[model samples]
Target: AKYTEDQLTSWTKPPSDSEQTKLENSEKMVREAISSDEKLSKKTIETFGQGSYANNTNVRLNSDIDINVKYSDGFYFDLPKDKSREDFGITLTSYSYEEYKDDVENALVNKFGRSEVVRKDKCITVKENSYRVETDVVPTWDYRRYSENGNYVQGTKFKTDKGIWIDNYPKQHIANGISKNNNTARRFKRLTRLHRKLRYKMIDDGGNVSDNITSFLLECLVWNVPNRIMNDYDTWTERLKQSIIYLYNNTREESSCKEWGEVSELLYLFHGGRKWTSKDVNSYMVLLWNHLEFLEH
Candidate 1:
């Protein structure tokens, strides 16, 4: 690839301070809107920042702040394939996830105005103004997954406009990324940032990247790379190349990556009918390798 050390080093840096300020403002306003909204009174809700901005792995190209508004009055539960909720002593709640999203929408609309906020399948997007960055406000319900051993793991879940439910563990994601970055001497996030920048560079440089190769997916891919490779490499270029090679080798088949998970380690990355297939990831690795101008195998 013939990139200089300094060039690769620069790619590891975070977004500019002004961008950071805008993101904070976006997050702050969303939190305030939800907390102050009377429509949400008498309901137990928690609002927090999530996604790449909150994780600190975001690149300048895509820096929108994501906030999760989770309703806690009642929760959705999941059990093993063969097991029923009754086995885990779980009961269904009459609360509606749709109505919750509507209340969140009302709060945002009341604060940001009807024109500034728009609803999507899974989130409500708050358009960027001169003061705040673009934001995605995700409305979710508390989720609990019970094991046969009579224990449950906590997470947040949301239903798409298409009637599909999505589960995520934002706390686990943040904690695991921080822990991994710590153990890897901060190379974890640096490599993730570098990878994100490369994706943007690939697009800008007239290379092909799939729509399915999302920023969050890229971060999780890098997170799955062993800490040893991230720590052993003396340079960002070496670390990135090795990390891509690892992903390339592992993503060639479903069996190899069947056990891989998102950064949170709560949900399988390639399973449960995810939008991006392992084959998609394998092809992306090939594109990344070629984009780097590395020597042919």
Candidate 2:
């Protein structure tokens, strides 16, 4: 192995003490910003950190937080194939998504200042300062997918400036991660951190990891690994090797990987308009195998 067990084990650690503090402070600041806005206070808006930071899988380089400012007063929904909105007792709101996004931008700008805040296509960016970590404030509406007997999956949805709708289930993602971590004897998240750490190193070493291979994709890739493999290994190196080998095998064909899903289990890992493909995942595993100097099977 290019990296010893001790070195690989050390890479499994989460963010540093200072980084954790900064993340906490950043999340709190965003919550305060949204709560302090009188216009937003009247609405049923919920603010919480999401993404890698919220999932506890973030490494030092990927520490920037995604804060969701969800307005539940209005929502987007998907009903059962045979069902209609009326069947689920759902109603539409007159408040537009555009107006809500504008309001969220105003609140963030007011708190963080115009220079520190930039309205991006999907989320408002809050630049990092000495006191706070870099934050992405996502202005979204509550999203629901209704099924039998008034059951619905809760999520967040927002439209990009280019008019594309993006939906995510951050809360579910967080819950599922925690559950998986516990089930895997807490090695699941440490392995996640390890993979992210190595990926960052790969980029620095001029590896061929493409721009399409995102941190999120990597996390989801790990999630698709079986629990037994995640827990059966005695060493981090063994765990990492087995996980990569599993990924490499599964990703060789689309038919074998079509059922893989993200951490949330709400979204399919491979879908239309997705940035990366199975071939890309196969390429990534190849790069990872070579980078770690693992013995080829």
Candidate 3:
């Protein structure tokens, strides 16, 4: 038995006004602090939010906000050896990620007070305020390539103060999500939230779902959903029904689009630090399908 329309609708509602305001306020403070620092200000290409909040598709349990400050005086790129242009190997320079990370950390510490900011391996986490979500201020740079046509590759790679560098394409990921949302009359996001909630509920009930069922991947599954069914759903149940059907088939194949979440454009949606095989997603879709059918009671 599928949930009532009202049941799913509640899950898709955006965060409260105060919650959003506080998040934006926190983002603004981080931006200002980074701007005030000379080293950071010198190379910063842009400062913006990414992740679920930025995409306008966050769930209530979202404890932390992601604010990515894009710097561009220099960066690191990741491409397959065969794909690397002749002589264009990813040239490593002394302008390393650690130095940049320290600078941004210090700037944030200067503003938010050292005690309130913990410099984790991946991000600088700011202690939560009463009205705000805890924030993860990520210092990133454009890990990109300017195409012959001047269209640049999308992806930002960053390293932690104590970790290996990681690569992701936040810019293209957001744009992709936006485009998919537009295509689905905004139902894409709603389905994303619904599917994510199902994952959360599954875990809460002690199901053995893979850790790869992230907000990002769930959204990708919804994005893979065909536009026709997404636009013509007669009910929320039908929407959920067909979306799962599409995902089960799509992700089951090696042919599943390699594109990661919209947050992941240039980055493929395959094994990285995390792995999500066809079987993994197939299980999720099947589990969701079974529950929906059971709910028809």
Measured by TM-score, the strongest candidate is: 2
Considering TM-score, where higher is better, how would the candidates rank from best to worst? 2, 1, 3
Worst 10 residues of 1 by lDDT: 15-24
Return the TM-score for each candidate structure. Answer: 0.92, 0.94, 0.85
Runs in model 1 deviating more than 4 A are 18-23, 81-94, 295-297
Q: Record all residue pairs in model 2 with backbone atoms less than 3 Å apart, i.e. clashing.
A: none
Give the Å shift of residue 291 in candidate 1: 1.8
* 1-297: candidate 1 lDDT, tens digit per residue: 856678888999887756556657777788788888997866888878888877888788545788898888888888877786675576566668888898899999999899999999889999986667789999998998878776888999999989988888998999999999999999999999998888888888787899989888999999899999998879887888899899999988789989999999988998766779999999999998877776666
lDDT of 2: 0.87
Candidates by lDDT, descending order: 2, 1, 3
Per residue, candidate 2 scores C-alpha lDDT tens digits across 1-297 of: 899999999999876756556667777888888888998878888778888877888887535788888888767899877886676676756789999889988998888899999999988899877667788888889999877776889999989999999989999999999999999999899889899889989999788888888888888888888899888889998999999999999989999998889999989988766988999999989989988987657
lDDT of 1: 0.86
Which residue pairs show collisions in model 1? none
Best by lDDT: 2
Model 2 — which ten-residue stretch has the worst lDDT?
15-24
